[PDB]
Amino acid sequence: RYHLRPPRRNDGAAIHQLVSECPPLDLNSLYAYLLLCEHHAHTCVVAESPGGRIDGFVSAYLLPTRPDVLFVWQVAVHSRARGHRLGRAMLGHILERQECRHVRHLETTVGPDNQASRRTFAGLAGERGAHVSEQPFFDRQAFDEMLLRIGPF
Template identity: 50%
Template sequence: MPADDTTDKKHQDDDLTLRKPESQDGPRVHQLIAECKPLDENSVYCNLLQCTHFADTSVAAELDGDLVGFISGYLPPKQQDTLFVWQVAVHEKARGRGLAKRMLAALLERDEAADVRYIETTITPDNEASWGMFRSFAYERRMPTEEFILFDSRLHFAGQHQDEHLLRIGPFNRDDA
């Protein structure tokens, strides 16, 4: 596939391409997330919005034409220096390649992330894969981290969902990312 303005040119190898998502990726993202437990599934419509409204702060990964990775993120309106990572999905056939960290790095290298100094995400206590990936990403770049409960199980989820811990990485300079 030739690189165009939606492809992250520095993050393309022979069989794996990282690019901005497009509207037609919505159903594929929905299917990918369904196959990546324990991620919370959203509606296809939500995934369409992630692939369109938030394309500049999201990334799709393709392997041999299949969607095998996706990060959805956005810049919170009152925190324009923060990339909030909503979800990270990596299909089992693409695991073990450092894909999640590669997608995150690709996001930070985009012009749209020029002012980003922090990464934030929420993670449930038992999601060891997410904790490991984000902590490793921060450690490799010597970025400080902090953590606290953002959404309490009892208060925000009526006991129907685990606590969501906020992990904050940064501050960092764009050159450090």
């Protein structure tokens, strides 16, 4: 029932509002979401209802120093959109794009703002014969948030 497509500039306000309505995700500035629409649309996705509401969003980008790794920043799915495995559908949709043809690995972090994320990434990994590992994100000089590595594809 959702149409998945890359985001466009006119989606930025709505994506910022969706993220706000999906606590505990960190709410970045509206301008940051607009930059995702402007510069990263080919590696991001929105899920748009029949009536035009944006009920899902994924922000992601290839790592500049490791271009076979897709790094997933935030996954937002509105309560009204639960029970469609939308987070997994959105990640799969990104990975099937031409810009992602050489992606071997996925990385994201899981901590206070996105524990519900783990099921989404394990689902993706499961659908693609890949496996989820985890490692502490921070080193011992800093200041549990974990880097998840999902692979291979």
